[PDB]
């Protein structure tokens, strides 16, 4: 099996090609980690396997969703270190995924009620409707467009972050720059019709994420940062009209970081939507980078051994089945029946129901 195949993912040596993929549970009361995290990723915590942990707050304005854990706070960076050392403890690698999800808020995720910002003032539609605190939906509200000036507080935000992460004892940390949050709001045309050197053209539209990863890169080194994006998926309004030529300069500009820096990142985090046309976008990603390819996004374990067979990517990552498989590796590894998992508890916030409470092997 493939899947078992060691890997060298930089300077970490994993025993295994299972990954956690990041997954927001809304668990982190008050945006602070608690122990019920702690429990979580150390149930599915795997001697020499990577962890990637779910979306965290890199400032104030940056939620979207409940009860997410953050990292720019030093209470939030105690808390952390102690969800760190519990999955380190169990010999596994972890990366926290810094995210801001830009116009995908709501004003009562904002301080003072604020509006949300994002590359212009374009709202999500009402195609779409964002999950309230107390379990019902609102409407998505108009987002405010930031200057330059504004723009490199928020990438020195990632920066900060960053550091805070490595400070927590986290191995890495991964740029969240798809889906339609934040960075993907400045990637896809359908969004970023920008006047300024932001946006524009594709060059211009990729200027974001280039700084953002420089950013993070300088602090705490290539190998220590793992950057994930989405150019076919139109999640939240944010699509692209030519989603390959979006992927592909975006790698341009990760390789070209790699080149400047001197050293490799982590790797290139890509989600693809759930065929034949999608795998080869994806495939064609995968060729053009130079570095570590970690695919995601409804692959299973035939499907998940084909990739790493075929060569078409090197890590894979699981969410969902991950969520109510804690030992999902191990259940890959005997090929056991996977338990079902339920999505009404996917955003909950008790500490043990839907969360840790999904049984071990049989
Ligand atoms: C409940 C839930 C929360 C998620 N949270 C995040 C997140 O915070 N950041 C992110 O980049 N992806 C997030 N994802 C997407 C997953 O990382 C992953 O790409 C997706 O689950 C892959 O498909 P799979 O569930 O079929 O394995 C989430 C998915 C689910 C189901």
Same mark, same amino acid.
């Given at each position: 099996?493939?899947?078992?195949?060691?890997?060298?993912?930089?300077?970490?040596?994993?025993?295994?090609?299972?990954?956690?993929?990041?997954?927001?549970?809304?668990?982190? +009361?008050?945006?602070?980690?608690?122990?019920?995290?702690?429990?979580?990723?150390?149930?599915?915590?795997?001697?020499?396997?990577?962890?990637?942990?779910?979306?965290? $707050?890199?400032?104030?304005?940056?939620?979207?969703?409940?009860?997410?854990?953050?990292?720019?706070?030093?209470? =939030?960076?105690?808390?952390?270190?102690?969800?760190?050392?519990?999955?380190? @403890?169990?010999?596994?690698?972890?990366?926290?995924?810094?995210?801001?999800?830009?116009?995908?808020?709501?004003?009562?995720?904002?301080?003072?009620?604020?509006?949300?910002?994002?590359?212009?003032?374009?709202?999500?539609?009402?195609?779409?409707?964002?999950?309230?605190?107390?379990?019902?939906?609102?409407?998505?509200?108009?987002?405010?467009?930031?200057?330059?000036?504004?723009?490199?507080?928020?990438?020195?935000?990632?920066?900060?972050?960053?550091?805070?992460?490595?400070?927590?004892?986290?191995?890495?940390?991964?740029?969240?720059?798809?889906?339609?949050?934040?960075?993907?709001?400045?990637?896809?045309?359908?969004?970023?019709?920008?006047?300024?050197?932001?946006?524009?053209?594709?060059?211009?539209?990729?200027?974001?994420?280039?700084?953002?990863?420089?950013?993070?890169?300088?602090?705490?080194?290539?190998?220590?940062?793992?950057?994930?994006?989405?150019?076919?998926?139109?999640?939240?309004?944010?699509?692209?009209?030519?989603?390959?030529?979006?992927?592909?300069?975006?790698?341009?500009?990760?390789?070209?970081? =790699?080149?400047?820096?001197?050293?490799?990142?982590?790797?290139?985090?890509?989600?693809?939507?759930?065929?034949?046309?999608?795998?080869?976008? $994806?495939?064609?990603?995968?060729?053009?980078?130079?570095?570590?390819?970690?695919?995601?996004?409804?692959?299973?374990?035939? +499907?998940?051994?084909?990739?790493?067979?075929?060569?078409? @990517?090197?890590?894979?990552?699981?969410?969902?089945?991950?969520?109510?498989?804690?030992?999902?590796? $191990?259940?890959?590894?005997?090929?056991?029946?996977?338990?079902?998992?339920?999505?009404?508890?996917?955003?909950?916030?008790?500490?043990?129901?839907?969360?840790?409470?999904?049984?071990?092997?049989?």
């Amino acid at each position: 099996n493939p899947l078992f195949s060691p890997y060298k993912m930089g300077k970490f040596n994993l025993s295994h090609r299972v990954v956690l993929a990041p997954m927001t549970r809304c668990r982190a +009361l008050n945006n602070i980690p608690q122990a019920a995290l702690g429990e979580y990723y150390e149930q599915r915590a795997t001697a020499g396997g990577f962890l990637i942990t779910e979306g965290t $707050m890199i400032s104030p304005t940056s939620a979207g969703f409940p009860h997410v854990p953050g990292i720019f706070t030093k209470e =939030q960076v105690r808390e952390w270190k102690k969800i760190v050392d519990v999955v380190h @403890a169990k010999g596994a690698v972890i990366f926290c995924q810094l995210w801001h999800v830009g116009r995908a808020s709501h004003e009562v995720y904002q301080p003072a009620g604020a509006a949300p910002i994002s590359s212009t003032e374009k709202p999500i539609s009402n195609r779409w409707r964002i999950l309230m605190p107390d379990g019902t939906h609102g409407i998505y509200p108009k987002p405010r467009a930031i200057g330059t000036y504004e723009i490199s507080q928020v990438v020195e935000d990632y920066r900060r972050s960053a550091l805070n992460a490595i400070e927590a004892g986290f191995d890495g940390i991964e740029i969240h720059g798809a889906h339609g949050y934040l960075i993907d709001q400045f990637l896809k045309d359908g969004i970023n019709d920008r006047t300024d050197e932001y946006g524009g053209s594709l060059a211009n539209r990729c200027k974001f994420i280039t700084q953002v990863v420089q950013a993070v890169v300088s602090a705490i080194g290539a190998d220590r940062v793992g950057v994930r994006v989405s150019p076919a998926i139109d999640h939240l309004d944010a699509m692209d009209s030519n989603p390959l030529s979006l992927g592909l300069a975006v790698v341009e500009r990760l390789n070209k970081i =790699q080149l400047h820096s001197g050293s490799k990142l982590a790797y290139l985090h890509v989600t693809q939507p759930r065929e034949e046309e999608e795998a080869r976008l $994806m495939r064609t990603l995968r060729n053009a980078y130079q570095g570590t390819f970690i695919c995601s996004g409804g692959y299973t374990r035939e +499907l998940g051994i084909e990739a790493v067979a075929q060569g078409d @990517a090197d890590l894979v990552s699981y969410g969902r089945l991950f969520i109510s498989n804690p030992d999902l590796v $191990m259940r890959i590894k005997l090929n056991a029946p996977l338990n079902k998992y339920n999505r009404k508890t996917f955003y909950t916030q008790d500490p043990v129901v839907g969360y840790t409470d999904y049984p071990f092997l049989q």
